[model samples]
Target: VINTFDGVADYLQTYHKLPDNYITKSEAQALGWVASKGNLADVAPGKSIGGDIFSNREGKLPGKSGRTWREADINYTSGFRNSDRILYSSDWLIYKTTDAYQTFTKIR
Candidate 1:
């Protein structure tokens, strides 16, 4: 599975699916995920922070009727989480952020 910005964009567009590492927040929670500790691997094998609903309350992204957005943390190998994240919509629109959703750039 690709992890780079464009790589993830292409993977999502081409396969119409998330990378293998992506796991829903709820799933991660069930697996004992705590925001303070990066214990995803210990709890859930081969899983990353993803598949969670991204509520665009700030309206930074273009919105359309019946479209729901999902979010995933990017480049999380270990240690404290970084600001990087990938936000994607059901319609294949994808964006990347390096500042923890402070800003985004459309990748697809």
Candidate 2:
């Protein structure tokens, strides 16, 4: 299952295709990370359900911030089965712009 605002159009084209399950947010705060009343206004506003970006100043790039309960839930749910073991891989992509509309980047 996946939850995103952009739908699966881009995802389908890149990855072979996703299972037919997906969800989107109905409200702004539903996505962005939760924070103290004062700190909440500073971070980017998007599906931060993992809370990795809000709990620490280093943000979610890597091993900087501590883990939260939300992450534990996601990890527990992802690829977890009653039977065999599965391997998980990590990848990162960063985009840079030349004219504010289009650019190039690397994907791994």
- Among the numbered candidates, top TM-score falls to 1
Cα lDDT tens digits for candidate 2, 52-106: 2222132322332433211101111222112211111122222121222123222
| Per-model TM values vs. the true structure | 0.84, 0.17
Give the CA lDDT, 0 to 100, for residue 70 in model 2: 12
Instruction: Pick out the ten consecutive residues of candidate 2 with the lowest summed lDDT.
Output: 80-89
lDDT of 1 by residue, 1-108 (tens): 545556667776778877777778787777776777767766655556777888887687778878888888788665445789888888778888898889888877
Can you tell me which runs of candidate 2 are displaced by over 4 Å? 1-18, 27-58, 62-107
Worst 10-residue stretch by lDDT in candidate 1?
A: 1-10
Clashing pairs in 1: none
The collision pairs in model 2 are none
